[PDB]
Amino acid sequence: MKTICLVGGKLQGFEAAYLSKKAGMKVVLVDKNPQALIRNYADEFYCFDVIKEPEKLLELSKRVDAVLPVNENLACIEFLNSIKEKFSCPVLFDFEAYRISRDKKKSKDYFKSIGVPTPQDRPSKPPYFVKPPCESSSVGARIIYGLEPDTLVEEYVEGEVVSLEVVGDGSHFAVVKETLVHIDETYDCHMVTPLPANPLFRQISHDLAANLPLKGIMDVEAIFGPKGLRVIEIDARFPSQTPTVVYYSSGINLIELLFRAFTDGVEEIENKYCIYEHLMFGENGVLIPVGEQVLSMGSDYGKFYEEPGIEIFLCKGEYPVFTMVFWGKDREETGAKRCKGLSVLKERFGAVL
């Protein structure tokens, strides 16, 4: 039995904990927040700030199999970079890839340097899409029909938002499974479903990882626009939401793959359907789709229900949010599970949908 130490107990932390448990690992969480969202979901919870008390983390490293940073606190990441040689287990992270992926302008220069199409900067005609250079979860992302001078302003590319993860070991780059990112009126993601192989997106994602070169995990997001595929961002960190869909739809556990990349290496290259989504139980049980930004304001997140083909997680807070995961052999079986899972909320809580 392996043990993984997660630094960060919010959405990334949840995804990593979830897949770690599927792999049969024990999950130790470190988080500076005594109310960390998944503090009760992990097997052990240590509350400390790793920048203030790095000796505690270094000591933990002596008794787990890997440390996985799952936060986007740049002070945390850079500090961990500074002490990484002192760890007694592998740190599953690519610090140089993260430096590029975290800054959207730098990422766009990287795309251009390798010939990868990306949305036009500073179009002369609306709509524009504007976003901060260094956020995630579509925080500050808006369509527009005095921004800070650093705001990204791009052509608005209409079409499907599609995601692919890549795990590299420095030499080989394992391109995993395409997923559709379903977006809400805030441009946040409320649902994810799997997509058929897309050889162009796969080669692009391969070359993005290969040119870094990636030793770790990164996801690549693109819009299938009217004039072709345009890469909008990369993120060299463990993602949320998509890895669960990747797990049911493809049978690949991104945590086990990432761990392999730092131990024996990875090699390049199921076909089930899965629906992953978030629903808030708003005033008198009207179910409303919500994105991650909503889920991340919760106080407590853990397993609510499971039966064959159905898992439900409850994120407590100002209005309960349910994360629902349905899977099955095709869309039809999965759609049936989604119905059964909704009726579990319908009969239990008087939910409406």
Ligand SMILES: Nc1ncnc2c1ncn2[C@@H]1O[C@H](COP(=O)(O)OP(=O)(O)O)[C@@H](O)[C@H]1O
């Ligand atoms: N230095 C740190 N030590 C321990 N936990 C940390 C540190 N920095 C961030 N975290 C934890 O990682 C989690 C995710 O952080 P972050 O990615 O910055 O998300 P957010 O901006 O939504 O709070 C949080 O629960 C945070 O408390």
Ligand SMILES: Nc1ncnc2c1ncn2[C@@H]1O[C@H](COP(=O)(O)OP(=O)(O)O)[C@@H](O)[C@H]1O
């Ligand atoms: N140029 C664009 N045109 C149209 N939609 C976009 C564009 N850039 C981003 N988006 C939308 O906004 C969301 C957030 O963009 P992204 O670049 O992924 O920032 P974040 O790091 O927050 O995810 C995307 O999933 C997509 O829905």
Ligand SMILES: NCCC[C@@H](N)C(=O)NCCCC[C@H](N)C(=O)O
């Ligand atoms: N592969 C597609 C990924 C799209 C998106 N769902 C995502 O990974 N979001 C990461 C947000 C995490 C914010 C914060 N660092 C936290 O951990 O809560």
Ligand SMILES: [Mg+2]
């Ligand atoms: Mg992003």
Ligand SMILES: [Mg+2]
């Ligand atoms: Mg994004």
